[PDB]
Amino acid sequence: PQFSLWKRPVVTAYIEGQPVEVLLDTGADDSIVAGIELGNNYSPKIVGGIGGFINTKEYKNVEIEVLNKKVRATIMTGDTPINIFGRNILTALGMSLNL
Amino acid sequence: PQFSLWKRPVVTAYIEGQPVEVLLDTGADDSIVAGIELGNNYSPKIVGGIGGFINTKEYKNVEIEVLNKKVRATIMTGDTPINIFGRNILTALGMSLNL
Ligand SMILES: CC(C)CN(C[C@@H](O)[C@H](Cc1ccccc1)NC(=O)O[C@@H]1C[C@@H]2CCO[C@@H]2C1)S(=O)(=O)c1ccc(CO)cc1
Ligand SMILES: [Cl-]
Ligand SMILES: [Cl-]
Ligand SMILES: [Cl-]
Ligand SMILES: [Cl-]
Ligand SMILES: [Cl-]
Ligand SMILES: [Cl-]
Ligand SMILES: [Cl-]
Ligand SMILES: [Cl-]
Ligand code: NA
Ligand SMILES: [Zn+2]
Ligand SMILES: [Zn+2]
Ligand SMILES: [Zn+2]
Ligand SMILES: [Zn+2]
Ligand SMILES: [Zn+2]
Ligand SMILES: [Zn+2]
Ligand SMILES: [Zn+2]
Ligand SMILES: [Zn+2]
Ligand SMILES: [Zn+2]
């Protein structure tokens, strides 16, 4: 696949079997999703961007299916306004950003 | 050029001659830069990031030098913790996300 960035690069992923729309985001080190519950085994952490900061719950070794690939990766949950697949997942998939 | 995403895709750029560190950000619609001073010829814009909304100053037809190219694009200045070149500039540069 190629994403020409004329539009937001948004795709459907399955996280622990739940479908979610996610933004493929080179400007995110990590990945953060809203609307899914991953359980009591997490590490709380704060992240920051435009507009401020949010509390998140960091989960390791989460099953992710996206772009017809299956990977296991770290996912934060929190009250993000958009679901973000950052570089930890993009690299796991073998994605690159090219000029 | 190629960004393999194991590290942040950060580069240096000039905005009307002013040097900046910028993050190539496929998750950003717009390009938002802090600290540079582009003058009084702007319109206010409202931008929503992970944490909430900020006001920005929108400047059109700004000269930008990055990745050995020169383009004219819209820059918004405001309080972002990381300067980001979003898809308005990535498309002007002819960049893409690939797997
Ligand atoms: C500002 C970047 C340095 C870090 N962001 C990733 C960006 O692509 C971030 C992703 C995002 C967030 C909220 C709504 C829509 C998209 N785009 C971003 O702010 O773009 C700004 C805000 C506006 C809406 C999208 O385009 C306009 C320009 S982020 O704050 O979301 C973030 C911060 C920390 C982590 C954890 O590593 C993940 C994401
Ligand atoms: Cl499986
Ligand atoms: Cl190329
Ligand atoms: Cl890299
Ligand atoms: Cl490297
Ligand atoms: Cl210059
Ligand atoms: Cl926009
Ligand atoms: Cl606006
Ligand atoms: Cl916005
Ligand atoms: Na526990
Ligand atoms: Zn499975
Ligand atoms: Zn499946
Ligand atoms: Zn909320
Ligand atoms: Zn090329
Ligand atoms: Zn590298
Ligand atoms: Zn110049
Ligand atoms: Zn830096
Ligand atoms: Zn915008
Ligand atoms: Zn505009």
Side-chain angles (χ1 to χ4, degrees):
Chain A
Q2 178 165 300
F3 299 85
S4 65
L5 307 177
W6 290 98
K7 34 208 298 250
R8 298 183 171 179
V10 169
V11 304
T12 308
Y14 296 82
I15 303 170
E16 285 215 320
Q18 330 198 10
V20 293
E21 297 288 313
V22 302
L23 181 63
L24 304 171
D25 197 346
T26 59
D29 294 342
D30 310 287
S31 300
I32 310 168
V33 306
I36 181 168
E37 181 49 65
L38 290 174
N40 292 321
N41 290 321
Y42 62 86
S43 181
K45 31 180 292 168
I46 297 162
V47 301
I50 292 167
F53 298 98
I54 63 173
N55 283 325
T56 77
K57 297 178 175 169
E58 186 185 57
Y59 299 90
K60 303 265 241 298
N61 291 310
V62 184
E63 176 198 32
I64 289 105
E65 283 167 283
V66 65
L67 297 185
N68 316 281
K69 273 67 223 64
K70 165 169 62 183
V71 300
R72 269 169 225 199
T74 303
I75 289 270
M76 275 171 293
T77 65
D79 194 15
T80 179
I82 191 160
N83 302 319
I84 296 164
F85 274 13
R87 293 187 299 101
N88 69 302
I89 289 177
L90 307 183
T91 53
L93 301 164
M95 310 222 59
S96 57
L97 173 70
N98 301 97
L99 189 29
Chain B
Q2 185 143 211
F3 296 90
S4 283
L5 303 177
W6 291 103
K7 58 193 193 21
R8 292 187 185 160
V10 167
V11 297
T12 59
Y14 297 97
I15 302 175
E16 301 278 349
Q18 300 185 43
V20 288
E21 171 179 358
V22 301
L23 180 60
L24 303 178
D25 190 349
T26 58
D29 302 338
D30 306 291
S31 297
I32 320 294
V33 184
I36 64 170
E37 299 165 3
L38 292 175
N40 283 167
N41 179 7
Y42 65 83
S43 289
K45 297 291 171 152
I46 301 163
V47 170
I50 198 159
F53 291 91
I54 63 168
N55 288 333
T56 65
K57 298 181 185 182
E58 182 194 71
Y59 299 92
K60 291 174 183 247
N61 262 47
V62 182
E63 272 181 67
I64 296 147
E65 298 181 4
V66 68
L67 292 177
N68 289 326
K69 322 214 63 239
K70 199 174 195 174
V71 299
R72 273 178 119 111
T74 298
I75 291 292
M76 305 168 169
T77 65
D79 189 25
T80 177
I82 300 177
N83 304 323
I84 59 180
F85 276 6
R87 293 183 300 98
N88 73 301
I89 288 173
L90 304 185
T91 58
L93 294 170
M95 301 190 75
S96 65
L97 209 46
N98 299 88
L99 217 198

